[PDB]
Amino acid sequence: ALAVACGQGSDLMDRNTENLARAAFIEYGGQPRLASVRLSSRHDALALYLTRLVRTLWKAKVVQVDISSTIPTSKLVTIQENVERLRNFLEANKSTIQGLAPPDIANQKEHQALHALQKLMESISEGISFVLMLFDERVSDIYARLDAVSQQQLKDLTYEQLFSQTPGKELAKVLVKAIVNRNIASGANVETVADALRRRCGSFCSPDDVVTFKAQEQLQRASEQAHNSPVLRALLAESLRLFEQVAGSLTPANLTTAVEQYISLKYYAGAIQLCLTVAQQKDRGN
Amino acid sequence: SSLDNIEMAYARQIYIYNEKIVNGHLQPNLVDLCASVAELDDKSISDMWTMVKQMTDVLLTPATDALKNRSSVEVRMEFVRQALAYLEQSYKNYTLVTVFGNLHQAQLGGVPGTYQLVRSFLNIKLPAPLPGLQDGEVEGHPVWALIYYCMRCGDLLAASQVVNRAQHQLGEFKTWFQEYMNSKDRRLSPATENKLRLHYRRALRNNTDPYKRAV
């Protein structure tokens, strides 16, 4: 019923059938009970459907090392669409489906269980979007300019780990921090790759990182335009504005790369002002 | 001495220009004699003389009255072209320093073609796609943005290349544009000029693609 309600079988009246399927999912889904709890058949059905949508992904490695993707991109798209249509179905019926809205111990764990599944769904969609973003770039190029531990972590990274384990999230945060670096070398567009990472895979990307990426953009593009005289004083001055904003949140690894570049461009006095500013914003109370 | 560094350098240049006329020599280019000092100052002044030279570098009628040259429609027309050529080239330098941090930096790697420069200019000034654009894209950028900033830089050829790769999408605009690039003085024939204006005025007076409106 859940599947039909989400449009499955419709690749073959159809609104009424899907509305009937919705009615069957609500009316006959059961309820949670004390036996440790026994969750409703409605919950197990949602878990069963979701699992079967990602069964080809879960235990599979993300990549195959000339690195490529284990799962074809076209398959990742359809899986994501199916997960999203399931999410859309739960949102449009948050008020009528038991357990979605907040509610005694039985209905409590029913709400917690259903909530956890929905958080996994959005994490699945974010994870898939991240993999698609990754292979839109030149991963082999990114994979080359990488440390061994992170190459090994990426070698045996599964979709399960990407979706549900901190190391996948931490590694994802490293890869995004690396792809933008490379994107700046190609230099097609920084602010487009920004809004790409900002929204779709939000909750895994950080807005303090994109402003940093915007700063490293002008820095590298100030090294690109380095031969020009009057164009840099606008690039380096605007890079400095971007750095000082995220001063209370710059990593020592980035702050160094910034100062290293400033010295190449004889921007001595400016680089000193950034480090002084980063200091005060890490310890405002002095 | 009551003369500042800049003023003094100009005086020396005006002494030369006088020494030349006092000894009957060739009348040298005064505008060049003044820009020689400008380079010793910030580019605020150099870019001025660049405009002065290009605005005065018009074919004149030697030994003709001043008022006559400036009233003649002949000369008044070339002024507009010399200015447009300055605004286009001036903007083209803005597009370089926007992509590369320094003019020198752009030169060492080589000034790219006006088309690839403009494309590498759209990447920055519009990173995300505006939802109101029309007529699709061309190699990853809206077709009308490319046409505008190419015309703005003054490379009509680069703009026409963009049109050639979107023949199906742009409709009848191809035969109209190809006439604009051919006809001199940046003007179309009254008949064809009438055909496009009425079309734009008909249902495109307010279009969601500003670049389309501009072109």
B-chain residues within 8 Å CB-CB of A193? 127
Classify residue B111 by its DSSP letter. P
DSSP element (H, E) containing A37? strand A37-38
Cβ–Cβ gap A228/B105 under 8 Å? yes
**Is B187 within 8 Å of chain A by CB?**
no
Task: State the burial class of residue B126 (Cβ atoms within 10 Å of its Cβ: 0-12, 13-18, 19+).
Answer: middle
Q: Which technique was used to obtain these atomic coordinates?
A: cryo-EM
What residues in B contact A228, CB-CB < 8 Å?
96-97, 100-106
Test A189 with B96 for CB contact under 8 angstroms: no
Instruction: Return phi, psi of residue A245, to 5°.
Output: -65, -45
Measured between CA atoms, how close is B121 to chain A, in angstroms?
9
Terminal-residue alpha carbon distance, chain B: 55
Q: Which two tokens stand for residue A223?
A: 């090294």
Query: Which amino acid is it at A275?
Result: C
Angle at A185 between CA A276 and CA A249, to 5 degrees: 30
Q: How far apart are CA A213 and CA A193, in angstroms?
A: 10
Whole-angstrom CA distances from B119 to B32, B51, B122 are 35, 27, 5
SS3 B62: coil
Q: Measured between CB atoms, which of B102, B123, B129 is closest to A225?
A: B102
Say how far apart CA A89 and CA A79 lie, in whole Å: 15
**DSSP three-state, residue B72:** coil
The closest alpha carbon to A168, from A207, A214, A128, A218, belongs to A128
Give residue A232's identity as a one-letter amino acid code.
L
Residues of B in contact with A192 (CB under 8 A): 123, 126-129
Return the bridge partners of B98, or none.
none
* Inter-chain residue contact A188 with B100, CB threshold 8 Å: no
SS3 of residue B167 by DSSP? helix
Distance CA A6, CA A90 (A): 10
- A142/B139 Cα distance (integer angstroms): 24
Q: How many CA atoms lie within 13 A of A23 on its CB side?
A: 6
Which element (helix H / strand E) includes A38?
A: strand A37-38
